[PDB]
């Protein structure tokens, strides 16, 4: 009888997945995921997606080919194509609009959603599909299944369609709906197949064989907040303000609205307050999960640790980079190991989030349906790339209005107090409710700006200014700038280096070491000056407190975030010293260059005598929102649907997805074999335990010995370096059974530019790109 998949277990026996069962299960699970959002369309797509496997040629292939080809016989990427039979059947048995709509989902369920005319042209595939359809229907008739196994009804689709589109379909919003249904199809297909791979009858069965609910998470959060309150009852200025913010968040959580903002002072508890708002709001309005998306130029780990401490290990899913195998190493198992964000708390970048929302491929689109009915927290949303701000805010508008999503725009840009101005965080959204509107104290820093005449300082001159000072955090705008400044510093200090040339784990270890030095510094007990050279990745969620911060010229919000690491708690008996300098030009994205330009023009307008003032912030956001092309790459008209009697439904999914890939200048992921610190069977130190680790091995020890102690705790090697070698072998044996390795490798990835080039510098392994250890240095990372 007809099968959908075949697999071979480690004892070399063969198991097969019955086709009829898989079609029914995928239909039902897709309809379940699609919920109230026109689920009949998803059901039909699940029912039809594998119709082409009824071809006798397909069943013959899956029974007669080699072991590897039999296990990968459904990966059409010669294989026997099967995805387009069900697409053609939909077109033939339904009206033009519904039929072609479904054809997009069904025919893309392996290759990704296509363009109509151009890339992967769905028009050509349909015009060439008569044989595949006829053979599939032959097979289906030959089989046992009842005549009405495919009960395709225009009228029922009409009713479901108009239930979702009360006013008919908007040609410019149609792609969001089709991508959502495509997500339902893909996630249900993959989950059912993964059930089969583990021997279970269906996805529900595997689920019941073996995540706390948001109620338990909320109770944990309350326990954690209460012990934070008791543990450090400062009864201080800062604790008072944090309390006021938390109370306003808890109050605003009851409001029946979809767009909120949370504007607080730096060090004001932005993350924990946003999480409390989100938990309570989610419980009151039936949101199913919380998504926390931070700027791409961040250390995700450092933000995620707050959530890990508040709510425990098993709840937080950390997902930033794309660890995709190259197409040539895609197998059935790697295909199934993709992320669907079914976890209740997700920590991610806004690039991962919105590039998934605009994607064509199944690996990126799988997670999409789990975003509906969620709370999404955008940390510093105003830094979303300006040139994509129109599609992104259009996306957000639709998701908030029609798909149950709540957005909270968090920013630490509350001005230093005459607060007679509001701000528009994102120029394109409907009205956004500000959570902290109750007002009212003491200054924390003094800020110095570069000269209006526009002159720049050499790296040596800036290093000389820094080296004249006992303790400085210096923040620069690019990795090369970090290298040049670090090199320029003298060798009589303790100097350290952070940039995105370093993997997360390396960064977190440097951060913990800096904490130890700082604790010594604050007791008057560090015998060398302390200089940390970092990029902007430190301003996004790293909690460090320096007495002096040097900041390269940048947008006023970036300057405020930098000052947030200078006398952060307001505990020092003198104001912090913040020096904004103008060096060699540079910036990692056109949007950050735009911020720099706005700050320069404000400086030339004499508006920055008090750079954190209400006047300064209002002027910065008005000028920023007056500048830049908000859809530079034409996303909106690429994804706007064109209809006609000849071409019922034309959308450029494939071209749009590829064009959106420029949101980060085509970032390519790269795995780096940085040997981590571990403790004794060697176990790598958990990311939120590093601080305790450094205290246990270093407290009471002279600084002159620290390095040797640290070097002794590196992950032990055998008599690629070890953890990596075992990990890659685990991926090679069975990447779905050991898919957890993928998540581990996320801490040892950096992203570089497709532009940059030695021959064996980079190799491939387990389908993933890896850098040879010779090219990754202990201080600077890669180059
Ligand atoms: Fe398929
Ligand atoms: Fe399938």
XYZ file of C-alpha atoms and ligand atoms in Angstrom:
785
model
C 0.000 0.000 0.000
C 1.006 3.624 -0.522
C 3.668 5.163 1.719
C 4.907 8.734 2.267
C 8.348 8.098 3.821
C 10.737 5.277 4.600
C 13.505 5.065 7.184
C 16.111 2.592 8.373
C 16.770 2.130 12.086
C 20.203 1.489 13.592
C 19.573 -2.286 13.581
C 19.195 -1.867 9.769
C 15.447 -2.617 9.628
C 13.155 -0.577 7.379
C 9.984 1.217 8.492
C 7.463 3.055 6.317
C 4.906 5.843 6.886
C 1.410 5.103 5.430
C 0.430 7.811 2.923
C -3.301 7.997 3.691
C -2.641 8.378 7.412
C -0.028 11.084 6.891
C -2.324 13.104 4.612
C -5.127 12.976 7.172
C -2.878 13.805 10.112
C -1.156 16.677 8.322
C -4.555 18.049 7.262
C -5.920 17.899 10.815
C -2.823 19.308 12.523
C -2.552 22.140 9.972
C -6.230 22.984 10.471
C -5.580 23.008 14.218
C -2.640 25.401 13.859
C -4.596 27.712 11.541
C -7.350 28.125 14.175
C -9.784 30.928 13.455
C -7.638 32.245 10.566
C -9.405 30.365 7.741
C -8.424 26.875 8.800
C -10.201 25.078 5.953
C -7.543 26.441 3.584
C -4.838 24.882 5.756
C -6.764 21.601 5.974
C -7.078 21.364 2.199
C -3.397 22.189 1.824
C -2.428 19.444 4.278
C -4.720 16.941 2.579
C -3.390 17.717 -0.919
C 0.298 18.435 -0.253
C 1.528 14.850 -0.841
C -1.073 13.853 -3.476
C 1.743 13.276 -5.962
C 3.148 10.417 -3.951
C 0.283 8.293 -5.315
C 2.259 8.046 -8.561
C 3.301 4.451 -9.119
C 6.723 5.812 -10.094
C 7.033 7.375 -6.636
C 6.125 4.202 -4.741
C 8.465 2.204 -6.968
C 11.296 4.644 -6.198
C 10.756 4.585 -2.449
C 10.785 0.756 -2.507
C 13.613 0.034 -5.030
C 16.322 2.679 -4.814
C 19.493 2.689 -2.742
C 19.200 3.043 1.032
C 20.153 6.730 1.016
C 17.897 7.596 -1.938
C 15.036 5.618 -0.399
C 15.432 7.548 2.857
C 15.512 10.824 0.874
C 13.001 9.936 -1.837
C 10.588 12.685 -0.757
C 13.224 15.474 -1.039
C 12.351 16.610 -4.593
C 14.935 19.499 -4.310
C 16.595 12.462 -10.419
C 13.863 12.372 -7.810
C 10.232 11.915 -8.809
C 8.502 15.290 -8.265
C 5.395 15.023 -6.132
C 4.487 18.497 -4.766
C 2.831 19.917 -7.819
C 0.165 17.254 -8.417
C -1.923 18.531 -5.496
C -1.395 22.123 -6.614
C -2.722 21.316 -10.086
C -5.637 19.385 -8.601
C -6.570 22.413 -6.468
C -6.442 24.711 -9.500
C -8.662 22.355 -11.526
C -11.326 21.590 -8.919
C -11.706 25.055 -7.360
C -12.328 28.571 -8.618
C -9.314 30.491 -10.016
C -8.493 32.526 -6.906
C -8.792 29.836 -4.211
C -7.222 27.218 -6.471
C -4.123 29.246 -7.301
C -3.826 30.386 -3.677
C -3.623 26.768 -2.529
C -1.300 25.882 -5.391
C 1.285 28.325 -3.977
C 1.363 26.519 -0.604
C 1.239 22.974 -1.960
C 3.842 23.419 -4.660
C 6.173 25.273 -2.318
C 6.131 22.735 0.509
C 9.641 21.586 -0.442
C 11.226 24.319 -2.595
C 9.771 27.306 -0.769
C 7.056 29.692 -1.921
C 7.805 30.838 -5.497
C 7.198 33.822 -7.730
C 4.372 33.437 -10.221
C 6.260 34.526 -13.339
C 9.887 34.551 -12.268
C 11.826 32.658 -9.586
C 10.718 29.057 -9.265
C 7.866 30.203 -11.491
C 4.673 28.614 -10.237
C 2.994 29.465 -13.549
C 5.408 27.239 -15.495
C 5.190 24.416 -12.947
C 1.419 24.365 -13.209
C 1.407 24.505 -16.992
C 3.704 21.457 -17.076
C 1.891 19.329 -14.471
C -0.639 17.300 -16.489
C 1.312 14.008 -16.388
C 2.101 14.176 -12.661
C -1.556 14.844 -11.890
C -2.852 12.060 -14.137
C -0.423 9.518 -12.679
C -1.279 10.608 -9.133
C -4.990 10.206 -9.770
C -4.353 6.808 -11.361
C -2.596 5.729 -8.185
C -5.298 7.180 -5.961
C -8.108 5.423 -7.872
C -6.150 2.145 -7.818
C -5.895 2.505 -4.028
C -8.527 1.748 -1.386
C -9.363 5.264 -0.288
C -12.992 6.419 -0.578
C -14.041 8.544 -3.535
C -14.634 11.594 -1.319
C -11.235 11.335 0.381
C -10.707 14.855 -1.069
C -14.002 16.692 -0.357
C -13.021 19.961 -2.056
C -15.865 22.488 -1.904
C -15.794 26.038 -3.230
C -18.731 27.052 -1.025
C -17.094 25.983 2.253
C -13.886 27.756 1.229
C -15.971 30.859 0.451
C -17.453 30.846 3.945
C -14.096 30.291 5.645
C -12.463 32.955 3.458
C -15.053 35.581 4.254
C -14.955 34.691 7.954
C -11.326 35.792 7.911
C -11.639 38.577 5.278
C -14.791 40.389 6.385
C -14.318 42.932 3.562
C -12.711 40.651 1.004
C -9.011 40.153 0.558
C -6.662 43.130 0.492
C -4.196 42.525 -2.342
C -1.416 44.034 -0.252
C -2.133 41.913 2.871
C -2.701 38.581 1.106
C 0.916 37.456 1.311
C 0.922 37.566 5.136
C -2.067 35.187 5.231
C -0.616 32.839 2.650
C 2.699 32.717 4.491
C 0.885 31.969 7.750
C -1.073 29.080 6.204
C 2.166 27.869 4.576
C 3.693 27.851 8.068
C 0.776 25.760 9.374
C 1.238 23.299 6.526
C 5.015 22.992 6.971
C 5.024 22.719 10.765
C 2.295 20.045 10.705
C 4.007 18.095 7.892
C 7.369 18.125 9.676
C 5.893 17.281 13.069
C 3.978 14.285 11.689
C 7.060 13.027 9.880
C 9.179 13.457 12.993
C 6.599 11.372 14.871
C 7.172 8.666 12.264
C 10.950 8.992 12.611
C 10.662 8.216 16.325
C 8.235 5.332 15.812
C 5.147 7.200 17.018
C 1.835 7.091 15.123
C 1.338 10.875 14.911
C 2.494 14.187 16.421
C 0.013 14.184 19.304
C 1.142 10.658 20.222
C 4.803 11.673 20.274
C 3.889 14.748 22.327
C 2.092 12.630 24.948
C 5.055 10.222 25.055
C 7.463 13.018 26.033
C 7.087 23.321 28.868
C 5.355 24.871 31.883
C 2.314 26.974 31.140
C 2.395 30.742 31.358
C 0.591 30.507 34.722
C 3.477 28.635 36.292
C 5.943 31.000 34.599
C 4.061 33.968 36.017
C 4.138 32.468 39.517
C 7.888 31.892 39.171
C 8.337 35.453 37.956
C 6.436 36.767 40.963
C 8.596 34.695 43.318
C 11.736 36.014 41.626
C 10.570 39.640 41.723
C 9.644 39.326 45.416
C 13.002 37.894 46.413
C 14.715 40.582 44.328
C 12.711 43.133 46.308
C 13.529 41.627 49.709
C 17.130 40.631 48.886
C 18.128 44.182 47.962
C 15.659 46.537 49.592
C 17.780 49.540 48.780
C 14.793 51.813 49.506
C 16.983 54.015 47.312
C 16.191 56.434 44.517
C 16.761 53.771 41.861
C 14.805 51.009 43.619
C 11.928 53.481 44.021
C 11.908 54.306 40.297
C 12.109 50.624 39.370
C 9.118 49.999 41.639
C 7.157 52.806 40.011
C 7.878 51.376 36.561
C 6.886 47.845 37.578
C 3.588 49.098 39.014
C 2.755 50.995 35.842
C 3.555 47.846 33.800
C 1.252 45.687 35.927
C -1.511 48.295 35.609
C -1.158 48.650 31.857
C -1.217 44.866 31.302
C -5.000 44.924 31.835
C -5.600 47.297 28.914
C -7.334 45.929 25.811
C -4.905 47.303 23.230
C -2.412 45.797 20.761
C 0.453 48.369 20.587
C 2.327 49.523 23.689
C 5.570 51.319 24.392
C 7.747 51.155 27.509
C 10.119 54.108 27.813
C 12.382 54.011 30.865
C 15.742 55.354 32.001
C 18.753 53.145 31.356
C 19.250 50.767 34.242
C 15.529 51.147 34.982
C 14.634 47.447 34.713
C 13.463 47.479 31.092
C 13.751 43.702 30.575
C 12.191 42.481 33.822
C 9.369 45.047 33.651
C 8.590 44.198 30.039
C 8.486 40.499 30.970
C 6.095 41.160 33.866
C 3.826 43.254 31.640
C 3.930 40.503 29.040
C 3.133 37.618 31.377
C 0.158 39.387 32.931
C -1.187 40.649 29.589
C -0.751 37.169 28.073
C -2.723 35.594 30.906
C -5.559 38.107 30.671
C -5.993 37.972 26.891
C -5.071 34.358 26.041
C -1.680 34.994 24.440
C 0.181 31.738 24.033
C 3.866 32.818 24.243
C 6.311 35.723 24.680
C 8.866 36.763 22.037
C 11.696 39.112 23.001
C 13.526 40.465 19.928
C 16.690 42.525 20.303
C 18.930 44.389 17.841
C 21.188 42.295 15.655
C 24.298 43.935 17.147
C 23.768 42.260 20.513
C 24.871 39.359 22.667
C 21.654 37.394 22.902
C 23.009 35.263 25.781
C 23.458 38.285 28.062
C 19.817 39.290 27.618
C 18.544 35.724 27.868
C 20.211 35.188 31.264
C 17.737 37.600 32.900
C 14.925 35.317 31.716
C 16.823 32.171 32.733
C 17.338 33.508 36.271
C 13.737 34.722 36.572
C 12.071 31.622 35.121
C 14.462 28.631 35.041
C 16.247 26.702 32.316
C 13.497 24.634 30.691
C 11.394 27.599 29.496
C 13.708 29.919 27.540
C 14.520 29.179 23.910
C 17.463 31.160 22.533
C 17.535 31.503 18.727
C 19.474 34.117 16.754
C 21.624 32.797 13.940
C 20.831 30.655 10.912
C 22.597 27.320 11.219
C 21.404 25.842 7.948
C 23.143 22.962 6.218
C 24.161 23.706 2.652
C 21.584 22.471 0.136
C 23.820 19.551 -0.925
C 23.907 18.053 2.598
C 20.173 18.429 3.229
C 18.742 15.069 4.302
C 15.347 14.058 5.653
C 16.652 14.446 9.200
C 18.320 17.855 8.794
C 15.099 19.041 7.127
C 13.175 18.073 10.276
C 15.585 19.645 12.778
C 14.346 23.201 11.997
C 13.031 25.536 14.715
C 9.325 26.164 15.157
C 9.400 28.390 18.294
C 6.825 26.278 20.092
C 8.542 27.300 23.385
C 6.694 29.748 25.678
C 9.574 32.240 25.996
C 11.718 33.002 22.947
C 14.773 35.312 22.871
C 15.814 36.284 19.349
C 16.968 39.189 17.191
C 14.554 41.445 15.342
C 16.395 40.342 12.180
C 15.596 36.679 12.829
C 11.985 37.645 13.631
C 11.225 39.849 10.644
C 13.345 38.020 8.070
C 11.360 34.920 9.091
C 8.086 36.837 8.670
C 9.105 37.760 5.121
C 10.608 34.410 4.145
C 9.960 31.927 1.363
C 11.846 28.773 2.536
C 10.319 26.134 4.826
C 13.154 26.368 7.369
C 12.434 30.046 8.054
C 8.661 29.865 7.552
C 8.012 26.907 9.966
C 7.980 29.172 13.078
C 5.608 31.813 11.642
C 2.262 30.407 12.836
C 3.494 30.324 16.463
C 3.972 34.085 16.335
C 0.261 34.681 15.951
C -1.449 35.355 19.306
C 1.873 36.157 21.006
C 3.368 39.086 22.876
C 6.381 40.456 20.970
C 8.766 42.751 22.836
C 10.919 44.857 20.490
C 13.897 46.125 22.392
C 14.988 49.519 20.996
C 12.610 49.177 18.082
C 13.643 52.537 16.611
C 16.891 50.876 15.537
C 15.109 48.570 13.092
C 16.846 49.235 9.712
C 15.270 52.415 8.385
C 15.312 51.218 4.757
C 13.009 48.293 5.630
C 10.874 50.221 8.119
C 7.818 50.497 5.845
C 7.401 46.731 5.141
C 8.238 45.918 8.756
C 5.718 48.354 10.212
C 3.136 47.229 7.642
C 3.817 43.702 8.899
C 3.412 44.797 12.487
C 0.185 46.643 11.750
C -1.361 43.577 10.166
C -0.153 41.209 12.870
C -1.493 43.412 15.628
C -4.855 43.902 13.968
C -5.701 40.544 12.427
C -3.471 37.907 14.077
C -3.787 38.624 17.814
C -0.213 39.905 18.299
C 0.706 42.425 20.977
C 3.796 44.579 20.396
C 5.647 46.271 23.259
C 8.232 48.780 21.979
C 10.818 48.993 24.799
C 13.378 51.757 24.760
C 15.709 53.103 27.415
C 15.438 56.665 26.000
C 13.516 58.356 28.846
C 15.092 61.839 28.957
C 16.855 63.342 31.929
C 14.575 65.956 33.498
C 10.690 69.879 30.295
C 9.061 66.678 29.134
C 6.526 68.692 27.159
C 7.098 66.474 24.092
C 6.029 63.025 23.114
C 8.029 60.961 20.688
C 7.057 58.708 17.826
C 9.226 55.599 18.229
C 8.305 54.092 14.837
C 6.945 56.436 12.201
C 4.546 53.957 10.629
C 2.431 52.431 13.321
C -1.116 53.103 14.587
C -1.312 54.841 17.954
C 0.843 53.227 20.627
C -0.109 53.323 24.300
C 2.807 54.386 26.524
C 2.946 52.250 29.667
C 4.959 54.678 31.827
C 3.074 57.974 31.656
C 3.083 58.668 35.403
C 6.005 61.026 36.071
C 8.682 61.589 38.755
C 15.271 62.345 39.772
C 19.076 62.680 40.123
C 21.660 62.966 37.344
C 24.141 60.146 36.878
C 26.712 61.383 34.313
C 28.209 64.413 32.616
C 28.519 64.194 28.822
C 31.134 65.832 26.590
C 30.587 66.136 22.794
C 33.142 66.474 19.933
C 33.807 69.876 18.328
C 31.318 71.311 15.836
C 34.168 72.100 13.433
C 33.962 68.429 12.379
C 37.602 67.522 13.026
C 38.418 63.882 13.675
C 40.864 62.318 16.103
C 43.316 59.584 15.164
C 43.055 56.261 16.972
C 46.363 57.034 18.693
C 45.024 60.334 20.021
C 41.870 58.697 21.374
C 43.946 55.905 22.935
C 46.163 58.539 24.545
C 43.105 60.240 26.045
C 41.817 56.880 27.323
C 45.204 55.783 28.731
C 45.458 58.979 30.786
C 42.500 57.602 32.822
C 42.346 54.787 35.407
C 39.237 52.925 34.195
C 37.475 53.357 30.844
C 34.929 51.510 28.755
C 35.404 52.625 25.135
C 32.685 51.860 22.579
C 33.353 52.059 18.824
C 31.194 51.553 15.755
C 32.908 48.649 13.896
C 35.059 45.555 14.562
C 38.046 47.039 12.736
C 37.762 50.168 14.853
C 37.829 47.954 17.935
C 41.023 46.316 16.700
C 42.678 49.648 15.864
C 41.783 51.239 19.184
C 42.833 48.163 21.176
C 46.161 48.009 19.342
C 46.716 51.732 19.936
C 46.441 51.402 23.730
C 49.706 51.086 25.716
C 50.786 47.817 27.291
C 51.039 49.040 30.896
C 47.309 48.528 31.506
C 44.866 45.674 31.763
C 43.103 45.894 28.383
C 40.344 43.642 26.982
C 38.336 43.435 23.773
C 34.740 42.681 22.726
C 33.393 42.619 19.169
C 31.200 40.462 16.959
C 34.407 38.813 15.658
C 34.041 36.754 18.887
C 31.479 34.045 19.565
C 28.927 34.472 22.322
C 30.750 32.160 24.717
C 34.047 34.005 24.300
C 32.232 37.318 24.817
C 30.484 36.096 27.975
C 33.797 34.895 29.449
C 35.419 38.275 28.766
C 32.410 40.012 30.326
C 32.670 37.910 33.513
C 36.390 38.588 33.772
C 35.728 42.335 33.421
C 33.261 42.032 36.285
C 36.002 40.636 38.496
C 38.385 43.450 37.608
C 35.685 46.039 38.221
C 34.886 44.669 41.696
C 38.573 45.059 42.512
C 38.537 48.556 41.014
C 35.585 49.655 43.144
C 37.415 48.517 46.260
C 40.468 50.682 45.393
C 42.462 47.532 44.845
C 43.335 47.149 41.117
C 46.961 47.984 40.575
C 46.771 48.694 36.822
C 44.466 50.928 34.805
C 41.585 49.062 33.237
C 40.548 49.652 29.623
C 37.796 47.699 27.866
C 37.445 48.235 24.112
C 34.017 47.131 22.874
C 31.609 47.627 19.995
C 27.965 48.526 20.368
C 27.157 44.940 21.330
C 27.858 46.056 24.928
C 25.100 48.748 24.900
C 22.407 46.162 24.231
C 21.647 44.508 27.541
C 25.110 44.045 29.074
C 24.970 45.172 32.698
C 28.337 46.760 33.493
C 29.129 49.827 35.593
C 32.173 52.007 34.572
C 33.109 55.413 35.991
C 34.075 56.711 32.553
C 32.635 55.749 29.160
C 34.101 56.793 25.805
C 31.591 56.572 22.925
C 32.213 56.965 19.208
C 29.896 59.447 17.514
C 26.556 57.775 16.928
C 22.818 58.240 17.193
C 21.592 59.958 20.318
C 19.873 56.760 21.484
C 23.151 54.829 21.173
C 24.936 57.552 23.181
C 22.308 57.238 25.891
C 22.688 53.447 25.939
C 26.446 53.909 26.347
C 25.958 56.360 29.210
C 23.799 53.646 30.786
C 27.064 51.757 31.492
C 28.597 54.794 33.205
C 27.711 55.125 36.894
C 24.847 52.792 35.965
C 23.256 52.462 39.421
C 24.001 56.050 40.412
C 26.061 54.739 43.357
C 29.191 56.669 42.869
C 30.067 59.788 44.913
C 30.919 61.621 41.690
C 29.152 61.942 38.363
C 30.276 59.567 35.663
C 32.362 60.986 32.829
C 31.061 60.333 29.289
C 33.195 61.476 26.353
C 31.737 61.294 22.844
C 34.547 61.452 20.293
C 34.738 61.714 16.529
C 37.152 59.211 14.995
C 37.557 57.652 11.553
C 34.135 57.308 9.956
C 32.354 53.956 9.880
C 29.195 52.080 10.910
C 27.889 48.477 10.601
C 24.642 49.420 8.838
C 23.201 52.294 6.847
C 20.756 52.951 9.664
C 23.479 53.458 12.266
C 25.241 55.792 9.845
C 21.929 57.684 9.643
C 21.869 58.057 13.424
C 25.436 59.363 13.308
C 24.465 61.934 10.677
C 21.494 63.138 12.709
C 23.674 63.614 15.785
C 26.250 65.546 13.730
C 23.580 67.862 12.336
C 22.168 68.430 15.841
C 25.647 69.247 17.121
C 26.043 71.741 14.275
C 22.663 73.232 15.303
C 23.818 73.726 18.919
C 21.126 71.389 20.276
C 23.386 69.135 22.354
C 24.482 71.205 25.346
C 22.425 68.721 27.432
C 22.313 65.596 25.245
C 19.831 63.599 27.368
C 17.359 66.511 27.749
C 13.713 66.275 26.585
C 14.488 68.852 23.867
C 17.445 66.817 22.595
C 15.503 63.536 22.413
C 12.447 65.063 20.722
C 14.655 66.767 18.132
C 16.619 63.559 17.477
C 13.507 61.482 16.786
C 11.867 64.176 14.614
C 15.003 64.515 12.471
C 15.508 60.746 12.236
C 11.891 60.205 11.211
C 12.297 62.929 8.619
C 15.141 61.067 6.884
C 15.767 57.963 4.802
C 13.848 55.898 2.246
C 11.493 53.676 4.225
C 11.114 51.018 1.491
C 14.442 51.246 -0.305
C 14.262 47.765 -1.790
C 10.676 47.770 -3.082
C 9.378 45.049 -0.726
C 5.820 46.393 -0.681
C 5.114 46.101 -4.404
C 7.051 42.849 -4.694
C 4.684 41.279 -2.178
C 1.498 43.076 -3.267
C -0.733 40.582 -5.077
C -1.781 41.156 -8.704
C -4.985 39.513 -9.925
C -6.543 39.066 -13.347
C -8.596 36.537 -15.262
C -5.493 35.325 -17.072
C -3.229 35.222 -13.974
C -5.535 34.777 -10.990
C -2.991 35.530 -8.246
C 0.563 36.823 -8.754
C 2.966 37.438 -5.815
C 6.769 37.511 -5.835
C 7.433 35.491 -2.637
C 10.814 34.146 -3.779
C 12.253 37.444 -5.049
C 10.933 39.339 -2.010
C 12.504 36.888 0.460
C 15.886 37.136 -1.283
C 15.693 40.935 -1.387
C 14.804 41.066 2.311
C 17.998 39.086 2.974
C 19.841 42.424 2.576
C 18.468 43.577 5.993
C 21.889 42.622 7.432
C 24.087 42.876 4.299
C 23.786 39.116 3.653
C 25.109 37.860 6.984
C 26.682 34.386 6.739
C 27.041 32.259 9.879
C 30.337 30.616 10.765
C 31.179 28.170 13.536
C 34.352 28.884 15.521
C 36.090 26.200 17.663
C 36.692 28.355 20.721
C 37.542 25.968 23.593
C 35.282 27.051 26.491
C 35.895 27.216 30.204
C 34.603 24.086 31.926
C 34.468 22.492 35.367
C 34.928 18.942 36.673
C 33.697 14.280 32.858
C 34.186 17.915 31.790
C 31.088 20.109 31.744
C 31.105 23.515 30.039
C 30.107 26.380 32.341
C 26.464 27.424 31.902
C 26.078 30.917 30.497
C 24.245 32.289 33.506
C 26.714 30.687 35.974
C 29.937 32.261 34.651
C 29.972 35.010 37.280
C 29.750 32.522 40.140
C 32.439 30.434 38.421
C 34.820 33.383 38.169
C 34.229 34.264 41.802
C 34.962 30.734 42.990
C 38.261 30.376 41.164
C 39.541 33.966 41.478
C 38.395 35.568 44.738
C 41.238 35.786 47.230
C 43.818 35.226 44.447
C 46.386 37.753 43.234
C 45.548 39.096 39.751
C 49.016 38.029 38.550
C 47.868 34.374 38.890
C 44.360 34.727 37.413
C 45.170 33.748 33.848
C 46.938 30.547 34.863
C 43.963 29.431 36.939
C 41.684 30.235 34.019
C 43.909 28.425 31.552
C 43.770 25.325 33.723
C 39.978 25.166 33.379
C 39.771 25.077 29.569
C 37.806 22.119 28.210
C 40.273 19.198 28.265
C 41.573 17.919 24.921
C 42.424 14.361 23.832
C 45.946 12.900 24.332
C 38.897 19.841 15.650
C 39.202 20.581 19.393
C 37.221 18.308 21.622
C 33.649 19.463 22.410
C 33.318 20.409 18.770
C 34.706 17.079 17.505
C 32.237 15.026 19.546
C 29.448 17.429 18.583
C 30.089 17.236 14.842
C 30.345 13.440 15.021
C 26.951 13.428 16.750
C 25.526 15.530 13.910
C 27.075 13.171 11.351
C 25.590 10.040 12.923
C 21.997 11.327 13.386
C 21.261 15.070 13.154
C 17.606 14.794 14.237
C 18.196 12.567 17.255
C 21.061 14.875 18.240
C 19.510 18.089 16.908
C 20.230 19.627 20.320
C 23.829 20.018 19.097
C 22.578 22.677 16.674
C 21.444 24.772 19.640
C 24.835 24.346 21.337
C 26.680 25.481 18.225
C 24.670 28.692 18.437
C 27.003 29.878 21.211
C 30.081 29.299 18.986
C 28.931 31.142 15.863
C 29.935 34.504 14.492
C 28.550 36.137 11.380
C 30.754 37.552 8.646
C 30.107 39.281 5.325
C 29.675 37.169 2.185
C 32.344 39.470 0.679
C 35.199 38.027 2.713
C 40.144 34.887 1.617
C 42.467 31.882 2.108
C 41.651 28.432 0.741
C 41.561 26.092 3.745
C 40.720 28.923 6.146
C 37.069 27.829 6.009
C 35.887 24.272 5.533
C 32.581 22.431 5.618
C 31.539 19.810 8.140
C 28.159 18.204 8.910
C 26.826 20.571 6.246
C 27.896 23.613 8.321
C 30.648 26.136 7.670
C 33.548 26.135 10.159
C 36.670 28.282 10.607
C 40.004 26.581 11.216
C 41.350 27.296 14.701
C 44.434 29.053 13.330
C 42.257 31.970 12.216
C 40.594 32.721 15.578
C 42.723 34.400 18.216
C 42.302 34.455 21.981
C 41.983 38.249 22.241
C 40.489 39.448 18.952
C 38.621 36.384 17.681
C 38.487 36.264 13.900
C 39.424 39.059 11.447
Fe 6.307 16.389 0.056
Fe 4.246 15.209 3.853
